[PDB]
RNA sequence: GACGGAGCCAGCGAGUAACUCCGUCGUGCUGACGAGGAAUUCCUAGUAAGCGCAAGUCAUCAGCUUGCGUUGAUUACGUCCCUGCCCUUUGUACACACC
């Protein structure tokens, strides 16, 4: 599949997350408009770019 | 807001609209202060002395002493706060700069 | 496939020392461990009574 | 300035100066057939009667790079590509020859 | 003399650390000492030279250091140090049994504890009650519910820790944590670094009155 | 109303841009009602201005004439 | 008399002294040549002060380095620190101070652990 | 056109353990072969319906869930099945309490219930049992998780009752020898087959109504046999 | 045309230096054999998370890359690989042995497939780093998971760990040493040939992430 | 013979219950000795 | 074990030791 | 890995090793074992761990204890979602701002 690549623009705070995962507002690179709130697992900084299998589902809380 | 730091043992705030003092942070023992810095988001005020080897941190919205953070073994010559990511940089006569 | 039977001890209990065929070097381990545990208990008994 | 002969269960490598074995390898298990340098002249191939053709670095006998099996017939000849540095031709008595890629 | 300056003004902080290449049972016991005190932190001792450890701790401004020594898993000694060139007592341990051996009944309480000292009578008793109570969090509440008992029993400080709760018909108990028969054997006015300071007091093992008297 | 002042700044930072969009639709249907608009006006203003200040980069790249 | 300079260099417990003087270009560690330095895989860790900046700066000086203490990797870090700051101090004193801060720029851009050891540790968290 | 192998004499096929986890293989893992031994004092008793009526009702669980015999006849069906003599089987069972027991195919299994149930406490209380020549360890309990000893690209299925039916012949034939396929045989009494839904990612049985465990795993074994033509 | 003359007497010093060393003074190569330039992270999203812009001589820089958070993503990738390669209970501390065995490893990587082994190991990392996984969320203590995405630091770290422990486990009881086993593992990972341990575990983990997505 | 020093008192049920009723009395009366603020 | 002993109120570990599992 | 050589680096103490190199062999075992299972415990930088080396300091310890040197990593350095534990519910402090 064509896979997409997206720049983190904000790490979310205060979300009630599973330990380890962190919700994150990431924004795409082939375009520059559409942002989407995924959730990552490892340590994540502001403006690292991460590879996304999907482009149509943002996640939510885990618990 | 502007902060002023003295040898009285006082880091005191100043409002520059009513042109008055409004807060006065002291230590606990009247030591002379020598350099100060303040978080750009004006929530903490840090001062460093000649004779205590520490950095005193005060909250400014409540005047109580927040903490005293250490690590040097000479007097802290100069302080600063980073204007964006709020890390603090101190420099002391231990031939040492330290990032908190 | 080449087939092998097990090497099995019927009525085997790991706590209790079973009937090993070595009368020469294994029952010596049985009675020597018995001697060691009774000599340990006797010297512990006499030193706590000395205390 | 060096050269190899294919003795039985060993390959012997000689110089142009001392005129005797300067290096050799003798941990083959069967009679070996083919010894062949690659065109760069760094490693060398050797095919045996077992059919597990072995390539290993020359000027250092005690290391074996990779011993890959051909067909179970004795690999009679094995020589590298004359200009390519990564494809190796082998032939045993399987009535088929192979261009392996290392 | 080094505690009226900072008696109840600053709450202490304590670093608890093991001897050198410690056992797993010793590290469990050091964790238990960290859970016994408030505001203590267990620090891994490995390749830490004792001079650069002790002055790195004193430039980091901690108040007390508690090293521990062992013998085949059984802990045998501890050492209380006070840092602004304060005194070090050092004690041995005799009947030490731990909750990690006995019962896995969940977590401990970590509340600001109360302190009980039974018949510390002499001047050495006052010095050791000062060196023992100035490593606890200053001024606990009224309804704080864990207490520590340090009972002198013929120079054998029995140490236990209890969680009490008052009924109206009385008060019932649940001990938890460590259990010590510690005893003082040295005390010197320097830190742990020197082995050059003046001996304030150490017990005399070999006089001909080594067993008659108490707080020798 | 019932969410607090402290965690609000991340409470309406969690939500995606589609939820920002329907929040704008809510702001239309709440300022077409002057009964409760005037009784929650600094709250509505602070929320709306922080929402579009944080989402400004996607807002001005949206292409909707009705928006 | 002859122009010389003595510098030090310290890893954990190894200590390296460097006598750098005006000479013909010989670099010796305890009389051994610089090529014959064990453990043979950090010979380039020893080489990089005289390799980063080119041997033409080493053509007129000769260096003798004594080393004591420490293990293998501590000794090779001590050697390279002593070589580096001996060259820097020689150029600070006897020749071009412009070449001095050229060399200092090169070494600090590569790693300043080749000029200043990181002494004051640990941390009581 | 291709010349024949120089030794068509059948010598021994490679009997394996978890040392190799690449080759084409039918892994069977038997779920809920409960091994609970209470030693009266005398000797142990297992979890059977017919070794006690007392101790099982002292431990409170019901009667019908006592089943080492059904997993025993399952593993005997496998140890007489031709893939066990071919060399593409590596038998993994696990107690519901987590005891991952592996069977290497060098074994002459006890051919009755009593000698099997007496061998099991030898296995449990030595964590090992050796062969009659003692050059390989032929039956042993080893490390959890089960993925520690099953291969990496191992497609996981289990026995299903409430799931549709496929053709397991082409279900294995779509893959090659660069892959291993594992089936979780649920040998419980009754209930829900969610014991290993952490691991199994595709759930399928081979008839409309529920099987028994031995004929179900023999169905999957004859499907693997028709796939590999054995 | 144009010239620049900096040296005016050739290098003739009293301790006669090796000629390959005084040839390496013109440009830094790893191990005096592999030039760090013309080596690119073919992927994006791992550029500036695998350090290759700063050339070294051997893989034994003694910097401090564990005190801050992300600054272990700036020490170069070769010694990142050898520090993960030293990790096992039998052979802790022996990083000189680790350095020399990855020296022999990437040397035979070059003599098999000759582009340069640092490019081989860089795109081996980019092909082995997993792009999604799951997390074992509670869900009432059921068999419950949910697919998430992986930050590139975790991608690089897990790729290095997978490659090193795959080389160890494939060289446990075989004739091959850990050197040539890591060599063939890195070559298969560079092609992405679905044969090596790390690429198999990567595709398995992304498979279960896609399944439980 | 004679001995140097009194050895370790082996902790008995009666001595631990004696110190237990001691701490019962003490924590009933709340007459313990802690530090105070300043 | 504070909540458990509170339940014992509203309804003594160290005189017994223990050992390991199977 | 076993060999047979070669190599060179350690700090604590004064009571009349490792590793490296060169050549050679070349790995299903002990007359009870093939790396330790179920699970559990502990652990965040000169830390886990490997390697030695001294000393024996009024209590403790020689089956060891304590120091000292060497070699030296992987993973977090976030989060209160789970397990808990604690604190507060006048913000009360002197502007601005928020509540």
Q: Round to whole Å and give the CA distance between E190 and E205.
A: 22
- DSSP character for J23? H
The nucleotide whose C1' lies nearest the CA of C25 is L31
Q: Round to whole Å and give the CA distance between H55 and H51.
A: 9
Residue G56 in contact with partner chain E when CB distance is under 8 A? no
Two structure tokens written together for G123: 């941390």
Q: Rounded to a whole number, what is the distance in Å from the CA of I152 to chain A's nearest CA?
A: 6
Edge to edge, the sheet with strand G27-29 lists G4-10, G15-22, G61-68, G27-29, G32-33
The distance (Å) linking the CA of E84 with the C1' of L56 is 31
Give me the domains of chain I, ranges plus CATH numbers: 8-213 (1.10.455.10)
Spatial CA neighbour of I201 closest among E128, J4, G42, H148 = H148
Spatial CA neighbour of I203 closest among I134, I152, I124, I128 = I128
Q: How far is CA E97 from CA B39, D83, E18, E100, in A?
A: 50, 77, 17, 9
Helices I178-191 and I117-128 sit at what angle, rounded to 10 degrees?
A: 70
Q: Residues 6 or more apart from F66 whose CB is under 8 A from it? A: none
Contact across the interface for E61 and B28, Cβ inside 8 Å: no
Contact across the interface for H133 and C4, Cβ inside 8 Å: yes
Residue G42: give its domain's CATH number: 3.30.230.10
Q: Are strands G15-22 and D87-91 parallel, antiparallel or unpaired?
A: unpaired
- DSSP character for C4? B
State which nucleotides on strand L lie below 7 Å from a protein beta carbon: 7-11, 17-21, 23-26, 28-34, 36-39, 41-50, 58-61, 63-87, 93-99
Q: Round to whole Å and give the CA distance between H142 and H138.
A: 12
Q: How far is CA C21 from CA C24, C26, C27, H43, H115, in A?
A: 9, 8, 9, 22, 22
Q: Round to whole Å and give the CA distance between A27 and A49.
A: 9
Q: Round to whole Å and give the CA distance between F13 and F54.
A: 8
Residue A8: give its domain's CATH number: 2.40.50.140
On whether H42 is known to bind a ligand per the annotation, the reply is no
Closest chain E CA to residue J12: E95
Q: How many folded domains does chain A comprise?
A: 1
Contacts E7 to J, Cβ<8 Å: 35, 38
Looking at the DSSP bridge assignments, the partners of residue D67 are D54
The distance (Å) linking the CA of G75 with the C1' of L5 is 27
Q: Round to whole Å and give the CA distance between E163 and E179.
A: 14
Q: Residues 6 or more apart from D37 whose CB is under 8 A from it? A: D4, D43, D44, D45, D58, D80
Contacts K5 to E, Cβ<8 Å: 163, 165, 174
Contacts J28 to E, Cβ<8 Å: 166, 170-171
Contacts E60 to G, Cβ<8 Å: 123-124
Question: Which residues in chain H precede a discontinuity of more than 2.5 Å between C and N?
Answer: 41
Closest chain H CA to residue C6: H131
Q: Please report where in the chains the tokens 């599992």 appear, as a residue.
A: K21
Closest chain C CA to residue J7: C51
On whether H8 is known to bind a ligand per the annotation, the reply is no
> Would you say B46 and E32 are in contact if contact means Cβ atoms under 8 Å apart?
no
Contacts G25 to I, Cβ<8 Å: 12-15
Contacts E61 to B, Cβ<8 Å: 54, 68, 70
- DSSP character for J8? P
Alpha helices in chain E (DSSP H): 24-36, 50-59, 99-102, 123-133
Which residue segment(s) compose the domain that A3 sits in?
A: 1-63
Question: How many alpha carbons fall within 13 Å on the CB side of residue D20?
Answer: 1
Closest chain H CA to residue C2: H106
Q: Round to whole Å and give the CA distance between H98 and H31.
A: 10
Contacts J8 to C, Cβ<8 Å: 51
Contact across the interface for E59 and B71, Cβ inside 8 Å: yes
Q: Round to whole Å and give the CA distance between E64 and E41.
A: 11
Q: Round to whole Å and give the CA distance between F23 and F33.
A: 16
The distance (Å) linking the CA of I103 with the C1' of L20 is 15
Residue E63: count other Cβ atoms within 10 Å of its Cβ: 21
The DSSP annotation for G57-84 comes to GSSSEEEEEEEESS-HHHHHHHHHHHHH
Contacts K2 to E, Cβ<8 Å: 109, 145, 163, 174
Q: Round to whole Å and give the CA distance between D79 and E81.
A: 77
Query: What is residue A32's three-state secondary structure?
Result: coil
Alpha helices in H38-93 (DSSP H): 55-58, 69-80, 82-86
> Would you say I116 and I35 are in contact if contact means Cβ atoms under 8 Å apart?
yes
Residue A36 in contact with partner chain F when CB distance is under 8 A? yes
Two structure tokens written together for G90: 């020689």
Residue G118 in contact with partner chain E when CB distance is under 8 A? no
Contact across the interface for A15 and F7, Cβ inside 8 Å: no
Q: How far is CA I106 from CA B66, D102, I183, in A?
A: 55, 15, 7
The nucleotide whose C1' lies nearest the CA of E72 is L64
Q: Round to whole Å and give the CA distance between G108 and G84.
A: 11
Contact across the interface for D65 and I112, Cβ inside 8 Å: yes
Q: What are phi and psi of B60, to 5 degrees?
A: -105, -25
> Would you say E72 and E96 are in contact if contact means Cβ atoms under 8 Å apart?
no
Question: How many alpha carbons fall within 13 Å on the CB side of residue I173?
Answer: 3
Looking at the DSSP bridge assignments, the partners of residue B67 are B57
3-class secondary structure per residue, E168-208:
CCCEEEEEEEEEEEEEEEEEECCCCCCCCCCEEEECCCCCC
Contact across the interface for D65 and I114, Cβ inside 8 Å: no
Q: How far is CA G72 from CA G37, G39, G47, G69, I59, in A?
A: 10, 7, 15, 9, 16
Q: Round to whole Å and give the CA distance between I57 and I25.
A: 11
Q: Round to whole Å and give the CA distance between H193 and H182.
A: 16
Two structure tokens written together for F48: 């709306």
The nucleotide whose C1' lies nearest the CA of A16 is L81
Residue E54 in contact with partner chain G when CB distance is under 8 A? no
The distance (Å) linking the CA of E122 with the C1' of L60 is 26
Q: Round to whole Å and give the CA distance between I124 and G110.
A: 27
Which residue segment(s) compose the domain that G112 sits in?
A: 1-125
The nucleotide whose C1' lies nearest the CA of H97 is L38
User: What does R_g of chain E's alpha carbons equal in angstroms?
Assistant: 17
Residue E8 in contact with partner chain B when CB distance is under 8 A? no
- DSSP character for E89? E
Residue I10 in contact with partner chain A when CB distance is under 8 A? no
Helices I152-170 and I77-85 sit at what angle, rounded to 10 degrees?
A: 50
Count of CB pairs separated by less than 8 Å, C with J: 4
> Would you say E140 and J32 are in contact if contact means Cβ atoms under 8 Å apart?
no
Residue J9 in contact with partner chain C when CB distance is under 8 A? no
Q: Residues 6 or more apart from I117 whose CB is under 8 A from it? A: I34, I105, I106, I107, I109, I110, I186
Two structure tokens written together for D73: 């017939």
The distance (Å) linking the CA of J9 with the C1' of L78 is 50
Residue F67 in contact with partner chain A when CB distance is under 8 A? no
Phi-psi region of B47 (alpha: psi -120 to 50; beta: other; left: phi over 0): beta
Spatial CA neighbour of I183 closest among H21, E157, C3, D66 = D66
On whether H87 is known to bind a ligand per the annotation, the reply is no
Å resolution of this model? 3.8
On whether H144 is known to bind a ligand per the annotation, the reply is no
Contact across the interface for J7 and C48, Cβ inside 8 Å: no
- DSSP character for I71? G
The nucleotide whose C1' lies nearest the CA of E27 is L42
Closest chain J CA to residue C51: J7
Two structure tokens written together for I174: 């075989």
- Neighbouring chains of B at 3+ CB pairs within 8 Å? E
Two structure tokens written together for H61: 């669980």
């Amino acid at each position: 599949t064509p896979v997409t690549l997206a720049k983190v623009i904000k790490v979310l705070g205060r979300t009630g997350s599973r330990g380890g995962v962190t919700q994150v507002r990431v924004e795409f690179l082939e375009d520059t408009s559409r942002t989407i709130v995924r959730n990552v697992k490892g340590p994540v900084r502001e403006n690292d770019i991460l590879v996304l299998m999907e482009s149509e589902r943002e996640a939510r809380r885990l618990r | 807001v502007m902060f002023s730091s003295s040898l009285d043992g006082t880091v005191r705030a100043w409002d520059l609209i009513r042109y008055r003092n409004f807060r006065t942070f002291t230590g606990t023992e009247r030591i002379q202060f020598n350099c100060l810095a303040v978080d750009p988001s004006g929530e903490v005020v840090c001062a460093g002395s000649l004779d205590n080897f520490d950095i005193h941190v005060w909250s400014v919205q409540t005047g109580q002493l927040l903490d005293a953070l250490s690590g040097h073994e000479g007097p802290v010559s100069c302080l600063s706060f980073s204007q964006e990511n709020s890390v603090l940089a101190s420099a002391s006569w231990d031939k040492t700069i330290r990032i908190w | 496939i080449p087939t092998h039977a097990p090497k099995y001890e019927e009525n085997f209990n790991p706590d209790k020392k079973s009937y090993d065929p070595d009368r020469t070097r294994s029952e010596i381990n049985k009675m020597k461990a018995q001697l060691k545990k009774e000599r340990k208990f006797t010297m512990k008994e006499i030193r706590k009574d000395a205390k | 300035h060096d050269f190899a002969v294919t003795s039985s269960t060993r390959v012997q490598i000689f110089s142009s100066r001392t005129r005797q074995v300067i290096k050799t390898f003798s941990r083959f298990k069967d009679v070996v057939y083919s010894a062949s340098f690659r065109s760069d002249g760094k490693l060398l191939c050797a095919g045996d009667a077992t059919g597990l053709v072995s390539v290993y670095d020359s000027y250092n006998p005690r290391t074996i790079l990779l011993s890959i099996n051909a067909s179970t017939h004795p690999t009679h000849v094995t020589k590298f590509h004359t200009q390519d540095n990564k494809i190796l031709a082998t032939a045993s008595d399987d009535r088929v020859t192979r261009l392996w890629d290392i | 003399d080094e505690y009226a300056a900072t008696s109840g003004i600053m709450d202490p902080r304590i670093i608890v650390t093991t001897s050198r290449d410690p056992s797993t049972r010793l590290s469990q016991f050091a964790k238990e000492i960290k859970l016994l005190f408030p505001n203590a932190v267990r620090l891994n001792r490995g390749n830490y030279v004792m001079p650069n450890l002790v002055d790195a701790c004193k430039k980091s401004g901690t108040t007390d250091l508690v090293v521990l020594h062992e013998h085949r898993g059984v802990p045998t000694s501890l050492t209380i140090s006070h840092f602004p060139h304060g005194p070090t007592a050092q004690f041995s341990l005799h009947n030490v049994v731990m909750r990690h051996d006995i019962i896995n009944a969940g977590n401990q309480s970590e509340v600001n504890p109360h302190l009980i000292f039974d018949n510390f009578t002499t001047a050495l008793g006052k010095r050791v009650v000062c060196i023992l109570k100035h490593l606890f969090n200053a001024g606990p509440k009224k309804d704080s519910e864990r207490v520590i008992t340090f009972a002198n029993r013929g120079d054998f400080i029995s140490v236990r820790q209890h969680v009490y709760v008052r009924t109206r018909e009385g008060v019932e108990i649940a001990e938890v944590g460590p259990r010590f028969e510690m005893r003082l054997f040295e005390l010197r006015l320097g830190t742990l670094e020197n082995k050059d300071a003046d001996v304030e007091w150490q017990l005399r093992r070999f006089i001909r009155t080594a067993n008659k008297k108490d707080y020798l | 109303l019932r969410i607090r002042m402290s965690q609000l700044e991340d409470a309406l930072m969690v939500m995606p841009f589609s939820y920002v969009l329907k929040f704008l639709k809510f702001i239309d249907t709440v300022m077409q009602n002057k009964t409760l608009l005037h009784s929650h006006l600094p709250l509505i203003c602070k929320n709306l201005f922080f929402i579009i200040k944080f989402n400004h980069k996607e807002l001005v790249s949206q292409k909707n004439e009705e928006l | 008399a002859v122009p010389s300079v003595q510098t030090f260099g310290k890893k954990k417990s190894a200590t390296a002294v460097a006598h750098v003087k005006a000479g013909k270009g010989l670099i010796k560690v305890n009389g051994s040549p610089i090529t014959l330095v064990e453990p043979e895989i950090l010979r380039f860790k020893v080489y990089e002060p005289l390799l980063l900046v080119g041997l033409d700066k080493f053509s007129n000086i000769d260096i003798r380095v004594r080393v004591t203490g420490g293990g293998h990797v501590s000794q090779v870090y001590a050697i390279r620190q002593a070589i580096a700051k001996g060259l820097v101090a020689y150029h600070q004193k006897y020749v071009d101070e412009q070449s001095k801060n050229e060399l200092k720029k090169a070494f600090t851009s590569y790693d300043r652990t080749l000029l200043i050891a990181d002494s004051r540790r640990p941390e009581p968290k | 056109q291709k010349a024949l192998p120089a030794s068509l004499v059948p010598q021994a096929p490679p009997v394996l353990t978890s040392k190799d986890k690449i080759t084409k293989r039918m892994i069977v893992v038997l779920a809920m072969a409960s091994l609970e031994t209470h030693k009266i004092s005398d000797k142990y008793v297992l979890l059977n319906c017919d070794d006690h009526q007392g101790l099982l009702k002292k431990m409170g669980r019901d009667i019908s869930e006592a089943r080492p015999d059904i997993t025993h006849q399952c593993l005997l069906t496998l140890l007489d099945s031709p893939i066990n003599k071919a060399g593409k089987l590596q038998v993994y069972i696990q107690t519901s309490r987590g005891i991952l027991i592996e069977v290497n195919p060098t074994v002459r299994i006890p051919r009755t219930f009593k000698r099997f149930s007496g061998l099991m406490v030898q296995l449990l209380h030595k964590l090992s049992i050796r062969s009659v020549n003692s050059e390989e360890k032929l039956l042993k309990v080893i490390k959890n998780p089960i993925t520690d000893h099953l291969p990496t690209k191992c497609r996981k299925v289990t026995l299903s009752f409430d799931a549709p039916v496929i053709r397991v012949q082409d279900y294995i034939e779509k893959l090659d020898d660069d892959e291993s396929i594992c089936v979780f045989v649920g040998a419980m009494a009754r209930g829900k087959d969610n014991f290993a839904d952490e691991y199994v990612d595709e759930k399928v049985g081979l008839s409309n109504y529920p099987l028994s465990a031995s004929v179900a795993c023999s169905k999957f074994c004859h499907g693997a046999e028709d796939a590999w033509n054995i | 045309d144009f010239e620049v003359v900096e040296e005016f007497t050739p290098v003739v010093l009293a301790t006669p230096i090796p000629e390959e060393v005084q040839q390496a003074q013109t440009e830094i190569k790893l191990f005096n054999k592999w030039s760090f330039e013309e080596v690119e992270v073919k992927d994006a999203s791992l550029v500036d998370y695998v350090q290759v812009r700063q050339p070294i001589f051997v893989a034994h820089t003694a910097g401090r890359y564990a005190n801050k958070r992300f600054r272990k993503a700036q020490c170069p990738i070769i010694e990142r690989l050898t520090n993960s390669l030293m990790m096992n209970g039998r052979n802790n501390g022996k990083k000189l042995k680790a350095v020399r065995i990855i020296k022999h490893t990437l040397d035979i990587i070059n003599v098999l497939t000759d582009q340069n082994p640092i490019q081989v190991v860089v795109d081996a990392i980019t092909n082995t780093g997993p792009r999604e996984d799951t997390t074992r969320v509670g869900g009432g203590g059921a068999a419950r998971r949910q697919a998430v995405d992986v930050s590139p630091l975790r991608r690089v770290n897990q790729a290095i760990a997978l490659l090193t422990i795959g080389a160890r486990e494939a060289a446990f009881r075989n004739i091959k040493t850990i050197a040539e086993t890591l060599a063939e593992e890195l070559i298969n990972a560079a092609k992405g040939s679905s044969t090596s341990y790390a690429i198999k575990k990567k595709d398995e983990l992304e498979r279960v992430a896609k399944s439980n997505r | 013979f004679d001995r140097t020093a009194k050895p370790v008192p082996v902790i008995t049920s009666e001595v631990t219950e004696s110190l237990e009723d001691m701490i019962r009395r003490r924590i009933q009366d709340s007459n313990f000795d802690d530090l105070q603020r300043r | 074990q504070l909540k458990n002993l509170k339940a014992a109120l509203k309804a003594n570990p160290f005189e017994i030791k223990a050992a390991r599992n199977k």
